[PDB]
Amino acid sequence: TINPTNYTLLKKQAASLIEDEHHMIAILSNMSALLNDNLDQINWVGFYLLEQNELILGPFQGHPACVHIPIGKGVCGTAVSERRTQVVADVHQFKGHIACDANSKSEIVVPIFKDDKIIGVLDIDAPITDRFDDNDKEHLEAIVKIIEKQLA
Amino acid sequence: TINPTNYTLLKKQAASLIEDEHHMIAILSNMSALLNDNLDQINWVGFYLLEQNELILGPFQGHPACVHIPIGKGVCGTAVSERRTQVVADVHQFKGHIACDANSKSEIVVPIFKDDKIIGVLDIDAPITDRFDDNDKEHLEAIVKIIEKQLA
């Protein structure tokens, strides 16, 4: 059972923990908390930042995670190499999953852009399979757009 | 009722999410998770970084928090101005508490040093009063020392 999220109001709330803020780390830290507090059936939510040609762990809500993820490897790295959101119904069956993805049963990763360049990703993992659908994808991408506008 | 923490083993574990790592944000993000997973009766645990003469919210586990905290104000700001750990049994009775400290009933804030300069603080809040004692203070300061050594 997956309790639904009122994404319409969530977008407005996100705009708050973002507006008038220019410290990216603070924005990402608070955003990870906001999403964690409003999404049911998830076990990890946070960000990875592209630094020195690899993904580096940023602010998140959940258990400790791998710090480095290569571009093109793992669910997160693949989101970067494909330059598009990844909605994974079953991580164990995802072509390219790595040991660092072990605790994720289903997942969604949305790339974050800045001047046509991917600067990181929003990663949300779930303890059950098929947690995310097209509706979640649309709303989460919209939330990422709000973040992008603030960081721009 | 406060369940005890095996700080002796926790220090060893912390050394892990820290060793061979040079990205401070990743270190702080994972450390906030490690502490959250091993401390009972707390509602917020994370870091604030000193940037442009004020504290700026960094990685943490919990609900959204204030991004800016002035030096010398609030429990966290006071830890910086006094340049020493603050163990607060009752935040509501703490001289200098601010609106941003509202959800914290008791708290401990440990300043983090780098070349004799305070670069931030470790902040842990609890939903009950008198959560932290001298024993917690000693062990948490030791953990902060491990973080300092890695960032040095």
Q: Is the Cβ pair B29, A56 closer than 8 Å?
A: no
Closest to A30 (Cα-Cα) out of A21, A43, A42: A21
Residues in A touching B37 (Cβ below 8 Å) = 63-64
- Distance, CA of B10 to CA of A64 (rounded, Å): 13
Cα B142 to the center of its chain, rounded Å: 12
What is the DSSP-derived secondary structure letter of residue B71?
Answer: T
With beta carbons less than 8 A apart as the criterion, state whether B67 and B90 touch.
no
Establish if B38 touches chain A: CB-CB under 8 angstroms: no
DSSP β-ladder status, A117-126 and B106-114 = unpaired
Q: Where are the domains of chain B?
A: 1-152
**Among A26, A63, A64, whose Cβ lies nearest the Cβ of B57?**
A26
Establish if A57 touches chain B: CB-CB under 8 angstroms: yes
**Among A33, A37, A65, whose Cβ lies nearest the Cβ of B30?**
A65
Strands lying side by side in the sheet with B68-70: B68-70, B54-62, B44-51, B117-126, B106-114, B86-88
Residues in B touching A26 (Cβ below 8 Å) = 56-58, 67
Total H helices, total E strands in chain B: 4, 6
- The chain B residue lying nearest A44, using CA atoms, is B33
- The chain A residue lying nearest B30, using CA atoms, is A64
Q: Is the Cβ pair A59, B64 closer than 8 Å?
A: no
Q: Is the Cβ pair B62, A33 closer than 8 Å?
A: yes
Give φ, ψ of B15 to 5 degrees.
-50, -25
Q: Which secondary-structure segment (H or E) carries A149? A: helix A134-151
At A87, which amino acid appears?
V
Establish if B57 touches chain A: CB-CB under 8 angstroms: yes
- Distance, CA of B124 to CA of B73 (rounded, Å): 17
Architecture in CATH of A1-152: 2-Layer Sandwich (3.30)
Q: How was this structure determined?
A: X-ray
Q: Is the Cβ pair A29, B37 closer than 8 Å?
A: no
Query: Tokens 């258990």 map to which residue?
Result: A63
Mutate to test the interface with A, among B20, B29, B100 (most CBs of A within 10 A): B29
Closest to A17 (Cα-Cα) out of A34, A4, A5: A34
Q: Where are the beta strands (DSSP E) in chain B?
A: 44-51, 54-62, 68-70, 86-88, 106-114, 117-126
- Distance, CA of B102 to CA of A19 (rounded, Å): 22
Q: Is the Cβ pair A25, B62 closer than 8 Å?
A: no
Q: Is the Cβ pair A30, B59 closer than 8 Å?
A: no
Establish if A7 touches chain B: CB-CB under 8 angstroms: no
- Distance, CA of A94 to CA of A109 (rounded, Å): 13
